[PDB]
Chain length 221, copies 4
C-alpha cells in the first residue's frame, strides 16, 4: 500500500518538470532577495519530493546498492540550491573566487542531473498503461504549466501578472486557445513555456476531439 | 398538459444557475443602490420561478407532506433577498446588531440552500433523455451565461461592458473562441464565469464536431 | 446554355444577401453624401443583378403571367434606391411632407420585399444538389461576408478599417478564428454581421473537419 | 547515396518558397543599405541551394543537354541579385538609364522564372509518396513561414517585431491559432504571408484531428 497509483507517477512527472523549473530559476537576472529566497523555499519543497521519489526508487533499504550507485549519479538533483547558494555566500565571506567558480560548475552539473531525471520521469510516464487516464493527465499537465508560469513570472517584475490566480487565468486562456491579449509572458523563457502550454492546449483540444468521437459512436447506441 | 417539455427542465437548470447568480450577487462591494435594487428586482423575478418550480415539485397539493417537509429544507432558497435586506434595514432602524449577524448567518444558509437546489437541478438535467437535444441545450446554456455575465457586470463599475447587448457580443465571442480582446471581465468572479463560458464554448465546439461526423456519415448517403 | 451552373445559384444567394446589405444601408446615420451615393452606385449594380435573376425567373417572355404577377409582389425589390431617394429630393424641392412619409413607407415595403426575396434565394440554395459543392460554397460565403463588412464599414467613420483590402484581412481572420484584435466592427450591426461571419468561420472549420475525416478514410487506402 | 530522402524534396520546396521570398524582397521601399545587403547575403545563400538543386536536376554531367536547355529557361532563377544590383550600381556610375530599365525588365524576368520554379517544386512535392510524412512536412512548412515572416519584417521598420526569435513566437502563435495580438505584420505582403500561415495553422490543426482519429481507432486496440 505505497505510492503506485497512476496519480503517483503523475506527480512524479510533475515534480520532474518542477525541478526543471527550479533549474530555470537558478540562473536569472539580478532579483529581489525576498522573492528570490521565496523561490528557494518552493525549491526546498520540491527537494522534499525528490527525497520521496528517490526513496521510492529503492525499496526503502540499501540492499539495492547498484541503484544506490546510480542514485549517486542523480543525487546532485537532490542537492538543494537553498543550501548551495547559502554556502556560496559563506565562501564569499571567506573570499574564495576560484571556489565560487567551482560551485558554479557544480550548479551546471546539478542542472544536467535534474534534466536527465526529467528525461527518466518523462520516459516512464510515456510507458504508462491507460491512455484513457489521459483525460485527467492532460488537465494535470495544464494546471502544472499554470503553476510553472506562476513560478517564473509572479516574482518577475513588470510582467503585469504579479497576482497569483491570474496564472490560472492566462493558463486556461491558453489551454482554451483564447488569447485574451491583456496577459502574456513577454519574456524569452516565459514565451518558451508559452510554446509548452500552447502545444499543451493543442493536445487538450485533441483529447476533446477524441471524446467527441467517443460520444458519437456511443450516441449511436 | 403541464410544464414537462425538455425545454421545461432546461429552464429549470437555467433558474437554478440564476439562483446561484443571485447568491453571488448578494455579497458584493459597496454598490450604487439603484442598480443594487435593480438586481433585487431580477432576483424577485427569479423567486417567482422558484415558486413555479417548487410548485411543480409537488402535485399542486399538500398531500406530498414528506416533500413539503423536504421543501422546508429548500424553502430558504424561495426566501427573497429583496425582502430580507429590507427587513434588515428595518432592524437597522431599530438598532439590533446581533440580530443583523443572525440575518447574515441566515443569508449564508439561504446561499447553501440555493447551491444544493442547483445540485439537484443539475443532476436531474444530467438525467435527461435525448442527447440530440443537446443541440439546443448548449446554445441555451450559452445565452444563459451571457445573461449571467450581464448580471454580474452591467452594474459593476469600470468594467467597460456597461452596455447591455455587448453581453451577447462577448458571450458569442467566447463561445466562438474568438477573444477580440477589447472586452473581458477583469474581475475575479467575472473570470470565474469566464472559466464557465470557456469550457462552455469548448463543449459547443465539441457538439459542432459531433454534428460534423454526423453530416459526414450522412453525406456518405 | 444559360446561367444554371451551381455557381449561378451561388451568385443568386450572394445577390440576395447583398440586397439585404443594401436594405441595411438605406437607413443609417447622417453620412457624407459622396460615400453615400457611392453605396447607391453599388446598389444600382445590385439592381442590375436583380434584373438578371428575375429575368431568369421567367423564360425571358411574358407568357408566365402568373409569375409576372408574383413578380409584382417582389418587383419592389427591383426598385432602385438611387432613383427613389433622388425623386425624394425632387419632392423636397416641391415641399411634400406627407408624400415623403409615403415614400418612407414605400422604403419599408421594399425592405420587406427584398427580405422575402432573400428567404426565397436561401431556401432554393438549401435545396442545392451537391454537398461536396460546399467546399467552394463556404469560401464563397466567406468572401461575400468580407465584401459585406466592407460595405457597411469602409464609408462608416472612425471604424479604423477605412482601407479596402483589410476587409479581406479581418474577414479571413474571423473565418480562421484568429481575432488579431487590432480590427473589429465596434458597431451594432457591424457586430451583427460579426455574428454572421463567426458562425461562418465555424462552418468553415466544420467543413475542414469533414475533409479531415475524408482524407483519413482515404489514407486508409 | 545522394540527396533523395523525403527531407530532400522537403528542403527543395523550402528553397523554392524562399526564392519567392527573395523575389518579394527585391522590389521594396527605400531601405537601409545594411539590412538590404544582409537580405542580399541570405539571397546568395539561397542561390547556393539553387546551384545544388539544379545540379541534382541533371546527373552532374552535361549529357542531359535537353534539360540543360530547359535549365536555360530557369537559369535566370540561379542569377543572383547580389551581383545584379551591384552591376546596376556600376552602370549607374556609367550613366546608362535605358540599360537600367533593361536590367529592371531582367529583374521581372528572373521574378517570373523563380515563380515557375516554385510551381515545379510545389507540383513535385504534391507528388510525394507518404502522406504520413505530412506529420513532419507540416511543421517544416510552419517553421519555414516563420523564417519567411522574419525575412520580410526583421529589417522592415516600425514592425515592432525587429527581434529574431519572436518570429518563431508569432509563428507558433498563428499555427496554434492564438492571436496574442501584441504582434502582427501590419503590412500588406506581411498580411499576405499571414494568409499563408493562417491556412497553414489550419492544415496543422487538420493533421492533428487526423492523428486524433488515428489514436482513437488505435485505443480501440
Amino acid at each position: 500500500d505505497v505510492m503506485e497509483h497512476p496519480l503517483v507517477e503523475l506527480g512524479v512527472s510533475y515534480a520532474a518538470l518542477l525541478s526543471v523549473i527550479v533549474v530555470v530559476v537558478e540562473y536569472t537576472m539580478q532579483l529581489s532577495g525576498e522573492y528570490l529566497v521565496r523561490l528557494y523555499l518552493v525549491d526546498l519543497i520540491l527537494v522534499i519530493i525528490l527525497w520521496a521519489d528517490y526513496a521510492y526508487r529503492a525499496y526503502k533499504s540499501g540492499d539495492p546498492a547498484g541503484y544506490v550507485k546510480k542514485t549517486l549519479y542523480e543525487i546532485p538533483a537532490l542537492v538543494p540550491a537553498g543550501l548551495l547558494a547559502l554556502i556560496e555566500g559563506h565562501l564569499a565571506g571567506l573570499g574564495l573566487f576560484r571556489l565560487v567558480r567551482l560551485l558554479r560548475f557544480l550548479r551546471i552539473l546539478l542542472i544536467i542531473s535534474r534534466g536527465s531525471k526529467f528525461l527518466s520521469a518523462i520516459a516512464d510516464a510515456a510507458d504508462k498503461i491507460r491512455f484513457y487516464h489521459l483525460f485527467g493527465a492532460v488537465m494535470l499537465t495544464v494546471l502544472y504549466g499554470a503553476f510553472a508560469i506562476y513560478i517564473v513570472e509572479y516574482p518577475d517584475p513588470n510582467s503585469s501578472i504579479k497576482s497569483v490566480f491570474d496564472a490560472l487565468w492566462w493558463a486556461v486562456v491558453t489551454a482554451t486557445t483564447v488569447g485574451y491579449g491583456d496577459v502574456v509572458p513577454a519574456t524569452p523563457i516565459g514565451k518558451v513555456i508559452g510554446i509548452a502550454v500552447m502545444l499543451t492546449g493543442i493536445s487538450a483540444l485533441t483529447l476533446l476531439i477524441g471524446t467527441v468521437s467517443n460520444m458519437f459512436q456511443k450516441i449511436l447506441v
